Design a protein around this ligand. Structure first.
Ligand SMILES: CC[C@H](C)CCCCCCCCCCC(=O)O
Length: 288
């Protein structure tokens, strides 16, 4: 037995963790209306991506990893000697990445593939990667890891805000809230993940009250969990995510693990400018 853990690029893991654990990545891509194509990786300057999205007359579109890109990664790992591959994917409710990883896993010869639907994105998806690696080190077998991740998913979630619903409506990634699209006025939507999809939670009078609402919703849930990891998951407005991060560090006990992260180009194309999420896991995830 020799177990590998891999993921798609939307887990937005740091290059430090990718290098240290040799994590293979099946990348998603963005295509701009000028025909320029970019594959996700930590060498892309995220500020450069936001600049091009702001200068685009048409919103950029995204692409999941092709099934052949999953296959090539599975073949490379097999040929390094791995017998089993745990694959952590972007939510199946918002992308076909998971289903293509699953079908690729049925198709590749000579290695066992265990594809897992995180039902989330960004570093909350990334926490499933880090939990699986930790379990591999402790000697667990693949089905035990999958059972542990399925339990973890019962106490994991995220709420988020956006400036405008126009990018999510364009791509079809907001479920419901059709009466909010275009209106809103000065009001800001608070959204949440629910069984893998993005749905309305509440509409509040200002952005400041929307960020206060993110904190309240999440703290009301995680107070019942025996362990807690929170991630601020920030977009292009550095100060909004930084201020929420510092506030959580103050309001929460040190028994909560509180971290800061940013999402990359693919998620940014769907949220638009001003996206900001607060995600949670009822586990103490190893972040080093
Ligand atoms: C704050 C960040 C939160 C946690 C994640 C928001 C995700 C928005 C929808 C992303 C859809 C990506 C589709 C990729 C594809 O298959 O073309």
């Amino acid at each position: 037995m020799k177990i590998a853990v891999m993921t798609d690029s939307t887990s937005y893991l740091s290059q430090d963790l990718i290098d240290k654990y040799n994590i293979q990545i099946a990348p998603l891509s963005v295509t701009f209306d000028d025909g320029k194509n970019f594959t996700e990786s930590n060498e892309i300057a995220i500020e450069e991506f936001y600049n091009k999205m702001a200068s685009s007359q048409t919103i950029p579109t995204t692409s999941q990893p092709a099934i052949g890109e999953w296959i090539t990664k599975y073949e490379m790992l097999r040929d390094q000697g791995y017998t089993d591959i745990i694959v952590i994917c972007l939510s199946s409710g918002i992308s076909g990445s998971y289903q293509s990883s699953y079908q690729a896993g049925e198709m590749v010869e000579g290695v066992n593939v265990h594809a897992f639907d995180s039902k989330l994105a960004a570093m909350i998806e990334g926490c499933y990667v880090l939990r699986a690696i930790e379990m591999v080190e402790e000697g667990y077998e693949p089905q035990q890891i999958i059972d542990d991740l399925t339990n973890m998913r019962e106490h994991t979630g995220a709420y988020l805000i956006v400036d405008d619903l126009k990018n999510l409506q364009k791509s079809g990634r907001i479920t419901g809230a059709q009466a909010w699209v275009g209106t809103l006025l000065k009001m800001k939507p608070v959204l949440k993940f629910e069984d893998g999809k993005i749905i309305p939670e509440e509409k509040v009078r200002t952005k400041k009250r929307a960020i206060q609402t993110l904190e309240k919703k999440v703290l009301d849930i995680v107070k019942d969990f025996e362990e807690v990891t929170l991630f601020v998951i920030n977009g292009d407005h550095f100060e909004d995510g930084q201020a929420l991060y510092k506030k959580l560090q103050d309001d929460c006990p040190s028994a909560y693990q509180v971290a800061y992260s940013e999402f990359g180009p693919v998620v940014a194309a769907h949220l638009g400018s001003g996206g900001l999420g607060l995600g949670y896991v009822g586990r103490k995830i190893r972040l080093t």
